[PDB]
Write a protein that binds this ligand. Structure first.
Ligand SMILES: Cc1cccc(C(=O)N2CCC(C(N)=O)CC2)c1
Ligand SMILES: [Zn+2]
Ligand SMILES: [Zn+2]
Ligand SMILES: [Zn+2]
Length: 459
């Protein structure tokens, strides 16, 4: 069940206008052969250019939508589009480049895929809505063969140079001319009615169709992400560590405790309504409050309507005390809320472009997140940075400069000289806070919140 059998059937109706006469009866084996590659009954970790829906989902970080459009087949120029927004024109002799032979076009393709993917993935998955010219164009920029390692590292080979006769990974690929052992999946095999634009536009208003290869490449990947991550969700799939996943996750846990602890000391709510993760624990275990939990999974399509979360008849009175939405994305938080909300517009190696202004946040798990919406926070304000500790001032066991800060809310600062312990803890908490913010999370609080109210929790 692991890899896609080359003897699996491929539906060819999508191909039959670019490739008139194509047999209705077709295997991957016969297709790969038609595309001009040979698999030489090779047991060597590359059983099939094509992959399963499941294998594609495990390798979502590798997805590059790919589309070719006739400009005028061997006679005519081809427009090559990628979900990066790039259009190359190959001649057989948004970004829109003029006509150039394959021997240069293939160099740009390696550069582009290398720069896009070296910090995402060990491979490429071309995501297709196949009509034929994209499949027949692959021979011009792709070599296949046994799985290999980089010449300069232990990462698997994704590129090949005919100049030096060597293999590189995405990190070491500079001056290479061929994509080596790519993967591909044809979305059109998944059983849709009607064309790409009609299927994409059911779900997504944010990507248009200018009738250029890059636009279709983008719609193809977007529709795929919609199918695999919006409509269908799988929180039982792991994904490897490629960045600061672990620091960001730790940071998030530290800020959550800090902000909620300070909220209860400052405003002394008798009840907290904790709306979201059904595995959640009390983030402030010692706090005095009545802690009531409401279960909701991450919304991956549209933000939850607060009408549905709350009404339809709990503590019922969610106007009593404070509401904690920790990555529980709604359309409009009530005024008595503490909110963490992911900003889908953030550029990072963890956040992949998604469907209808949403983004795909891949950190241990994959979480499609609805489009960041400023209007959601109208009853709240941005939560200002601050560090609060009631821990004793006592070093124990990190070279020093005396810390001066208005936002270091401690006994020692109240007494006008921050102790070394609270200065180390403060500087750590600020780093965590910046990690978390710069990872795209944004924090919001009820308007009455005032760090001034914390200073009398020491007297
Ligand atoms: C509502 C709920 C249920 C379960 C877990 C969470 C949570 O805390 N997430 C998931 C989504 C989040 C994101 N949008 O990136 C990353 C961490 C939220
Ligand atoms: Zn390498
Ligand atoms: Zn789209
Ligand atoms: Zn101190």
């Amino acid at each position: 069940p692991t890899h896609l059998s080359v003897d699996t059937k491929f539906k060819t109706e999508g191909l039959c206008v670019d490739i008139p006469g194509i047999p209705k009866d077709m295997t991957y084996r016969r297709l790969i052969s038609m595309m001009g590659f040979k698999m030489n009954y090779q047991v060597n970790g590359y059983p099939n250019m094509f992959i399963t829906r499941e294998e594609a989902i495990r390798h979502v970080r590798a997805w590059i939508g790919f589309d070719v459009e006739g400009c005028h087949g061997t006679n005519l120029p081809l427009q090559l589009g990628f979900s990066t927004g790039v259009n190359l024109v190959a001649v057989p002799t948004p970004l829109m480049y003029k006509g150039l032979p394959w021997n240069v076009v293939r160099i740009k393709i390696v550069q582009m895929l290398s720069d896009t993917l070296k910090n995402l993935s060990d491979r490429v998955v071309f995501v297709l809505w196949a009509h034929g010219f994209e499949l027949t164009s692959m021979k011009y920029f792709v070599k296949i063969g046994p799985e290999r390692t980089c010449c300069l590292c232990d990462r698997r080979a994704t590129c090949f140079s005919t100049a030096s006769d060597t293999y590189a990974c995405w990190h070491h690929s500079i001056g290479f001319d061929y994509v080596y052992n790519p993967f591909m999946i044809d979305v059109q095999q998944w059983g849709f009615t009607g064309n790409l634009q009609s299927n994409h536009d059911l779900y997504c208003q944010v990507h248009g169709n200018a009738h250029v290869a890059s636009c279709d490449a983008i719609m193809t990947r977007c529709l795929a992400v919609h199918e695999c991550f919006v409509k269908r969700v799988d929180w039982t799939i792991e994904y490897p560590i490629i960045g600061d996943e672990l620091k960001i996750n730790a940071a998030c846990r530290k800020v959550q405790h800090m902000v909620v602890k300070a909220a209860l000391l400052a405003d002394k709510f008798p009840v907290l309504h904790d709306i979201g993760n059904p595995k959640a624990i009390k983030c402030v275990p010692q706090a005095d409050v009545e802690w009531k939990f409401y279960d909701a999974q991450p919304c991956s399509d549209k933000a939850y309507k607060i009408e549905e979360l709350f009404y339809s008849y709990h503590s019922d009175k969610f106007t009593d005390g404070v509401c904690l939405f920790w990555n529980c994305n709604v359309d409009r938080y009530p005024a008595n809320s503490i909110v963490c909300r992911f900003d889908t517009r953030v550029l990072s190696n963890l956040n992949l472009p998604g469907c209808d202004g949403g983004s795909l946040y891949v950190n241990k798990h994959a979480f499609h997140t609805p489009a960041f919406d400023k209007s959601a926070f109208v009853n709240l304000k941005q939560l200002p940075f601050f560090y609060y500790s009631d821990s004793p001032c006592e070093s124990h066991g990190i070279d020093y400069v005396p810390l001066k800060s208005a936002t270091c809310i401690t006994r020692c600062n109240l007494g006008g000289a921050v102790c070394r312990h609270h200065a180390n803890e403060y500087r750590l908490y600020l780093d965590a806070y910046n990690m978390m913010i710069s990872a795209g999370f944004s924090l919001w609080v009820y308007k009455q919140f005032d760090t001034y109210n914390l200073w009398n929790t020491f007297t």
